[PDB]
């Protein structure tokens, strides 16, 4: 696949549509779209391991981290495959997403099709929050909305 | 063995969890779980091409049919990859699913991870309905509920 899409929903008002496009299988993945219903400010934006929503967002499990690294920000050498940093919500709760990543893929081992995209309660501290939880989830807190990443037309 | 799962939801009361499991890459896929909120009787149970829920179940598109064949029942040589036939709902609206299929896969060209599982309004006529539409969708009608097939623990 060269295109993917994720519909984000949760227990509250957080909702959105996130697009994915990868023209070359060894090139970067463009990640774009919008999320509404967030509090103003920074929110962690991660690919979690499982495309399992049986129990809500919790069933998606830990961060997608097949190379077993500690948590970092997208520009860090050391980070999970699923570490896409933070998205930024405006005063109206709207976060416009426009990201380009070369670690995630729409194919092969780093393939995220069938996994889960999650927008978190708080800002992802990129591994520099200065405690143990920081080197794991970036202290991004709870799962506000999620969706299984699906093959798109 | 790779494992997958799908949460079925729609506009109405149809809801269900469907599990997928495949021990070997050339093995058959066990699929099983339950669906409630269905009218008593038969319901088409099909894998559609896209894991895109942006406009509901409609956006999943057509049947997963990469070999461009005519629609049939699961046992038929002539069938869509996505042709899993029908499920049966009892008098309390509950459809227990337990299927084994060797055309679908959780890997390769027939992989369904990231595609959409759909439970339909009417019975799938397995291409034995005697009309043009029978040979395309089995006249299963409406999409009651769907979910993207995601990777599972
Ligand atoms: Zn991480
Ligand atoms: Zn079909």
Swiss-Prot record, chains A, B:
Residues annotated to bind Zn(2+)? 63, 71, 80, 83
**What, per the annotation, is the impact of changing residue 122 to E?**
Mimicks constitutive succinylation state; decreased activity
- Which residues bear S-palmitoyl cysteine-type lipidation? 6
Q: What is the effect of changing residue 113 to T?
A: In ALS1; destabilizes dimeric protein structure and increases tendency to form fibrillar aggregates
Q: Which positions are linked by 1-(tryptophan-3-yl)-tryptophan (Trp-Trp) (interchain with W-33)? A: 32
Record's Gene3D superfamilies? Superoxide dismutase, copper/zinc binding domain
Q: What is this protein called?
A: Superoxide dismutase [Cu-Zn]
Q: Which organism is it from?
A: Homo sapiens (Human)
Q: What gene does this protein come from?
A: SOD1
């Amino acid at each position: 696949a060269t295109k993917a899409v994720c519909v984000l929903k949760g227990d509250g008002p957080v909702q959105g549509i996130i697009n994915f496009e990868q023209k070359e299988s060894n090139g970067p993945v463009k990640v774009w779209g919008s999320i509404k219903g967030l509090t103003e400010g920074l929110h962690g934006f991660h690919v979690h391991e499982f495309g399992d929503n049986t129990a809500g967002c919790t069933s998606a499990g830990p961060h997608f981290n097949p190379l077993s690294r500690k948590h970092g920000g997208p520009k860090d050498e050391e980070r999970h495959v699923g570490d896409l940093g933070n998205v930024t919500a405006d005063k109206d709760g709207v976060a416009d997403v426009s990201i380009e990543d070369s670690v995630i893929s729409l194919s092969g081992d780093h393939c995220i099709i069938g996994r889960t995209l999650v927008v978190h309660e708080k800002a992802d501290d990129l591994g520099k929050g200065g405690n143990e939880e920081s080197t794991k989830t970036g202290n991004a807190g709870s799962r506000l909305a999620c969706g299984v990443i699906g093959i798109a037309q």
